[PDB]
Design a protein around this nucleic acid. Structure first.
Ligand code: FES
Ligand SMILES: [K+]
Ligand SMILES: [K+]
Ligand SMILES: [K+]
Ligand SMILES: [Mg+2]
Ligand SMILES: [Mg+2]
Ligand SMILES: [Mg+2]
Ligand SMILES: [Mg+2]
Ligand SMILES: [Mg+2]
Ligand SMILES: [Mg+2]
Ligand SMILES: [Mg+2]
Ligand SMILES: [Mg+2]
Ligand SMILES: [Mg+2]
Ligand SMILES: [Mg+2]
Ligand SMILES: [Mg+2]
Ligand SMILES: [Mg+2]
Ligand SMILES: [Mg+2]
Ligand SMILES: [Mg+2]
Ligand SMILES: [Mg+2]
Ligand SMILES: [Mg+2]
Ligand SMILES: [Mg+2]
Lengths: 97, 48, 122, 58, 23, 128, 72, 74, 137, 86
RNA sequence: AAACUCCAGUUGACACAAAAUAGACUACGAAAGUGGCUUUAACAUAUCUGAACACACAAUAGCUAAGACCCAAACUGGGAUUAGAUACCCCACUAUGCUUAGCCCUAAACCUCAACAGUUAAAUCAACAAAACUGCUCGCCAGAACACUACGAGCCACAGCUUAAAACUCAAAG
């Protein structure tokens, strides 16, 4: 018949699925430097996923690790350890504007 | 394969014979679990 | 199974710290534990002032003990650590490396929910 | 990103209990709320205080 | 729906408990 | 219960495990494992003793054996935790599901049914 | 279409060609379309490896004077 | 409204009629009152765009069917 | 150097000085901003009381204490007494969301004191004692 | 009580600009939810009332975030009328 | 106003109470319920349906016995308000909220939408609400009120719970 008729395929132009910054990386409660990146510098509050940008699976892991480290004597609760204030900013939040 | 790997790790396990020697070695060494993540998903190990 | 003892020790000199570490490891072995490794995380200022055994501690030596013990040993060891005056805080958790991370493909987009309300003209 | 509405409301397909209980249908209207006037507040309280304080002194 | 049916049952039960207490 | 030195079901048949170090043996034994690992060996022993084909796990007989192992675990848990209503419900439900399995087995295969009752020490009672 | 697999790969490797698409001209051929054409011509020769066939396609265009600046 | 001028010229050129403006209610179902008792309604209505400016069917589509007037439509 | 809103850490070495004194040595002005009163106590870096003033001690009574002007007058009173003892720079630590939360600091500045930092220490229990029941108004 | 003081919720004044410092501090507490949290803690909010408020605040976020998404999508069409007179 | 001044602020020591943020997540459990940390045990069923009562559970309140004391708080007392105020507002303090061991077995226990399987075709379809339906099974309902009542029976319940009528009355109730 005719060879120009559309054929059945999976979308070849489909882009790869997005991945959170922590995708494929183990989150440890001992890694206080990583955990501090997701808490408020002034109040120590854990940031929501809309700020942190983490996936649902990693947001839970970070939350559970922060809570564990804070009660085991590794992480402060009411503020962010000043030693980690100069680490890379990975959270979409602006306090001065 | 797992049993073979385990049989190799047990060689380094702490025992009552090497307990004191292993305790001194631990006091001298330092282990760091801290590292940071960038907005690009790259690990930034600590420089110390 | 495999456990991890997060041991925050009192700020002491090297001879006393060695005695405490050996005493703690011997207690684990006495309860049937196969100690695998001992890691020194270094002495740092505590995140908050911890009051233990009628003493206010502001500094401590952080250590890690990797060991295999029977399930019944965990409760016994927790009791022993509570009675040791050289230990500020002691916690036993299931070793994190035993837990395997499932492979993640990525974030799948969720489309806006549809057909929540009838299409009648209001 | 807008929070999800999948499984949030009590519907026949939804097996779980409802997360949300909107009192009005979650449907965009053709209008927005009117601009609200700012609440009036007393002005020049500080300047009044310094004048009244000096009167007491003098 | 209004609560007129519940209100009638509410008064019945109140008066009943008051009667039982008295007697 | 199986001795604590018993090797795990997964590592029991790997070649050369009888000659490994004593530490490796006890690390791979029941002593260093959770309660569920010992339950698997219990199920294995009952399957070999009673069932004709231990490899077939979909048979009405294997399901009765597996359920009885679970029933026994709940009774041991409930002995320690007396006010655990969640597990008391699971035990009573499990007992009723084994009765239904036994009734279906009694109606279909009596010769095999009698072997289940003997091996597992289950007495079939008729409902009121 | 079958060539969408080629077009998707080309756009990923090289990106949008410098030549701007002129959709007004019905006979306009883009750098990607030229690649598909050469790719198909080399497929008729009897090449069975996509990666090898993709590499050969790029080499033929480079010889013809086409500018193929990879994203890298 | 991008083609209102074009369509009004095309109708005048072929000696026909165009309605590219806001369609007032009752132009077809109430014509004898709007125009006069002896007004003659269209015999054919050609919709070059069948949707109004809120992306809903042009009202005359329904009203043309009420008046039994055949309609051509893109 | 760029201005850092974050306070200097006591352990680390900083170049910021106020009258030759480090951040850890500046006296502290504790402001308790309640719904019905504002209390201001100026203490030294070693917790030695220097001055105290509240809306009640300034002659305001009943609902007149819970006003901005009443708190501002209390701030000026505390500043006057604190300046006699040698206080110039103060670290403000406010507690509560009362009407005199900001006015108290304005009074302290109007009294001749310089505020170098503002700390909020309003108590927030993390789960705590159950508060009084809601009012039926 | 146990933590080090003068690290949490502390803001430094720039060039004696206390007004801007208080606004910054007040903005930090609002963005974190402390201001709104403190006010709700004055009186006990019963669980059913807290669940009823959370449901209300969540339905309002979804509506407001969808209306804003439509405003920004249609703002392009605020242009002047191109076919004026047609 | 009363109350407090054996008060208040700073600093230090300091629970058998309650568990910010995360949570814009929507998971777990039969439901009731479950959101601080750790560990142990642990989440029935390879067809489905299947009970007011059998079997086992079941928020809060409440009962019995022994403990705990931060805060909250029926009742009660004081202050205020009011024509009165046995309320709404303020203060103080109980039972109670907690733990242990037994009861009691109720809820707008409602997501007022039963379990399992399947459909989106046509007249979709009273109205509103959360679109309209098919197969199959158990449970339940036949005007309002009397009536979450009387009597009988069962129950660790004894001012209780479950089951649950009739007479007279009306032409409506919904
Ligand atoms: S997207 Fe892979 S773990 Fe977050
Ligand atoms: K908490
Ligand atoms: K009921
Ligand atoms: K309901
Ligand atoms: Mg409603
Ligand atoms: Mg209403
Ligand atoms: Mg009545
Ligand atoms: Mg008085
Ligand atoms: Mg929350
Ligand atoms: Mg059933
Ligand atoms: Mg029945
Ligand atoms: Mg109960
Ligand atoms: Mg009780
Ligand atoms: Mg009280
Ligand atoms: Mg009491
Ligand atoms: Mg408690
Ligand atoms: Mg409920
Ligand atoms: Mg049913
Ligand atoms: Mg009742
Ligand atoms: Mg009764
Ligand atoms: Mg009776």
């Amino acid at each position: 018949s005719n060879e120009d008729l559309p054929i059945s395929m999976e979308n070849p132009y489909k882009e790869p699925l997005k991945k959170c910054i922590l995708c494929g990386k183990h989150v440890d409660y001992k890694n206080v430097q990583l955990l501090s990146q997701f808490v408020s510098p002034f109040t120590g509050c854990i940031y929501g996923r809309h700020i942190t940008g983490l996936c649902g699976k990693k947001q839970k892991e970070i939350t559970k690790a922060i809570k564990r480290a804070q009660i085991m004597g590794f992480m402060p609760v009411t503020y962010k350890d000043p030693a980690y204030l100069k680490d890379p900013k990975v959270c979409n939040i602006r306090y001065r504007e | 394969r797992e049993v073979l790997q385990l049989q190799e790790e047990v060689k380094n396990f702490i025992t009552r014979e090497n307990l004191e020697a292993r305790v001194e070695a631990a006091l001298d060494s330092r282990k760091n679990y801290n590292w940071a993540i960038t907005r690009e998903g790259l690990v930034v190990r600590p420089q110390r | 199974p495999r456990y991890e003892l997060a041991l925050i020790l009192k700020a002491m000199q090297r001879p006393e710290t060695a005695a405490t570490l050996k005493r703690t490891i011997e207690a684990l072995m006495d309860r049937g534990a196969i100690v695998r490794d001992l890691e020194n995380l270094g002495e740092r200022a505590l995140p908050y002032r911890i009051s233990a055994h009628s003493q206010q501690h502001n500094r401590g030596g952080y250590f890690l003990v990797d060991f295999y013990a029977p399930t019944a040993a965990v409760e016994s060891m927790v009791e022993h650590l509570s009675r040791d005056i050289d230990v500020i805080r002691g916690n036993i958790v299931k070793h994190p490396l035993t837990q395997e991370l499932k492979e993640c493909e990525g974030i799948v987009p969720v489309p806006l929910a549809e057909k929540l309300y009838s299409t009648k003209k209001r | 990103a807008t929070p999800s509405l999948r499984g949030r409301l009590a519907r026949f397909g939804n097996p779980r209990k409802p997360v949300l209980k909107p009192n009005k249908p979650l449907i965009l209207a053709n209008r927005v709320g009117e601009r609200r006037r700012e609440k009036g507040e007393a002005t020049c309280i500080t300047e009044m205080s310094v004048m009244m304080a000096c009167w007491k002194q003098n | 729906k209004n609560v007129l049916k519940i209100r009638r049952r509410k008064m019945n039960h109140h008066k009943y408990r008051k009667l039982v207490k008295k007697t | 219960d199986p001795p604590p030195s018993t090797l795990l079901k997964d590592y029991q048949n790997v070649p050369g495990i009888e000659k490994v170090d004593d530490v490796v043996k006890r690390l791979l034994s029941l002593e260093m494992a959770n309660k569920k690992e010992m339950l698997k060996i219990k199920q294995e022993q009952f399957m070999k003793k009673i069932v004709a084909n231990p490899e077939d796990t979909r048979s009405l007989e294997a399901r009765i054996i597996a359920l009885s192992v679970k029933i026994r675990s709940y009774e041991e848990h409930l002995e320690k935790h007396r006010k655990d209503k969640a597990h008391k419900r699971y035990l009573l439900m499990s007992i009723d599901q084994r009765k239904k399995m036994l009734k279906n087995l009694r109606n279909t295969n009596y010769d095999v049914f009698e072997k289940i009752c003997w091996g597992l020490g289950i007495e079939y009672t008729f409902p009121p | 279409y079958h060539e969408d697999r080629i077009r998707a790969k080309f756009y990923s490797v090289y990106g949008s060609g410098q030549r701007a698409f002129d959709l007004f001209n019905p006979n306009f051929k883009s750098t990607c379309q030229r690649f598909v054409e050469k790719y198909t011509e080399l497929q008729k020769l009897g090449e069975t490896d996509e990666e090898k066939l993709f590499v050969e396609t790029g080499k033929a265009l480079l010889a013809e004077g086409v500018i193929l600046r990879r994203v890298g | 409204r991008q083609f209102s001028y074009l369509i009004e010229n095309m109708a005048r050129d072929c000696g026909e009629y165009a309605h590219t403006r806001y369609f007032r209610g009752g132009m077809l179902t109430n014509a004898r009152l709007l125009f006069g008792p002896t007004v003659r309604l269209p015999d054919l209505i050609i919709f070059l765009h069948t949707l109004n400016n809120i992306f809903e069917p042009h009202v005359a589509v329904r009203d043309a069917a009420k008046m039994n007037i055949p309609t051509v439509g893109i | 150097t760029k201005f850092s809103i974050y306070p200097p850490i006591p352990g680390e070495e900083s170049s910021l000085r106020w009258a030759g004194k480090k951040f850890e040595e500046i006296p502290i002005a504790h402001i308790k901003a309640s719904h019905n009163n504002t209390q201001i106590q100026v203490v030294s870096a070693s917790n030695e009381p220097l001055a105290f003033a509240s809306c009640g001690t300034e002659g305001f009574r009943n609902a007149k204490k819970g006003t901005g002007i009443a708190a501002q007058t209390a701030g000026i009173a505390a500043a006057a007494r604190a300046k006699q003892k040698g206080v110039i720079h103060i670290r403000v630590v406010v507690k509560g969301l009362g009407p005199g939360r900001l006015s108290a600091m304005h009074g302290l500045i109007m009294g001749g004191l310089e505020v170098i930092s503002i700390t909020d220490n309003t108590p927030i229990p993390h789960x705590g004692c159950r508060p009084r029941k809601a009012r039926k108004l | 009580a146990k933590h080090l003081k003068f690290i949490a919720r502390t803001v430094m004044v720039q060039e004696g600009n206390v007004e801007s410092a208080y606004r910054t501090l007040n903005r930090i507490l609002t963005m974190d939810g402390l201001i709104e949290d403190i006010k709700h803690r004055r009186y006990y909010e019963k669980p059913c009332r807290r669940r009823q408020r959370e449901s209300y605040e969540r339905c309002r976020r979804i509506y407001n975030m969808e209306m804003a998404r439509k405003i920004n999508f249609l703002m392009r069409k605020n242009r002047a009328d191109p076919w004026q007179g047609c």
